[PDB]
């Protein structure tokens, strides 16, 4: 979210740190997940699909 500039750091660590902090906070994900109303049927459907894919991926290692 916020970034600190110190020790006359070059203007390359600043942007990289800002991007890393932003993706850690996941601001883009949350703002993308709210541009349209997403009904509870689609909620449960998407979560069930995510669950089945996650379990398949976990099993596939063995």
């Amino acid at each position: 979210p916020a970034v600190k500039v110190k020790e006359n750091e070059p203007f390359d660590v600043a942007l990289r740190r800002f991007k890393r902090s932003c993706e850690k906070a996941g601001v883009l994900a949350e703002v993308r997940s709210r541009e349209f109303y997403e009904k509870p049927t689609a909620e449960r459907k998407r979560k069930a699909a995510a669950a089945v894919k996650r379990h398949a991926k976990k099993v596939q290692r063995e």
Binding site: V3, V5, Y37
Partner: protein, 119 residues
């Protein structure tokens, strides 16, 4: 024919998908100079590109350099492209980037968003 000086201001980036708006104020939030990607002469899909953001941010910074402004707190708001392009555009103008923050509003539950597009 009115003149005043200011040092260590704050610059706002409003980067939506369609357009990005750059403005400069003091710590008190009084407008000094602003520039828009629509005003930079793009008028279309190009208006969304990060290059238009760079052009608008540098134009606004060069307009605001008349007041001095040896220090800037730049804060960004919006998920559109050019989120970081305007930062480098302002750094090209010859300011001191004191800090960079995001003020993207995130409702906890809030109002419900509009209906889903069927395209």
């Amino acid at each position: 024919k009115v003149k005043k000086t200011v040092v260590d201001g704050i610059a706002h980036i409003h980067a939506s998908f369609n357009n990005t708006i750059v403005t400069i104020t003091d710590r008190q939030g009084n407008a000094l100079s602003w520039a828009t990607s629509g005003g930079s002469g793009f008028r279309g899909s190009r208006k969304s590109t990060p290059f238009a953001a760079q052009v608008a941010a540098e134009r606004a910074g060069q307009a605001a350099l008349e007041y001095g402004l040896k220090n800037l707190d730049v804060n960004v708001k919006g998920p559109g492209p050019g989120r970081e392009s305007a930062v480098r555009a302002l750094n090209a103008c010859g300011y001191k980037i004191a800090s960079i923050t995001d003020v993207t509003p995130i409702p906890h539950n809030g109002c419900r968003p509009p209906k889903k597009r069927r395209v």
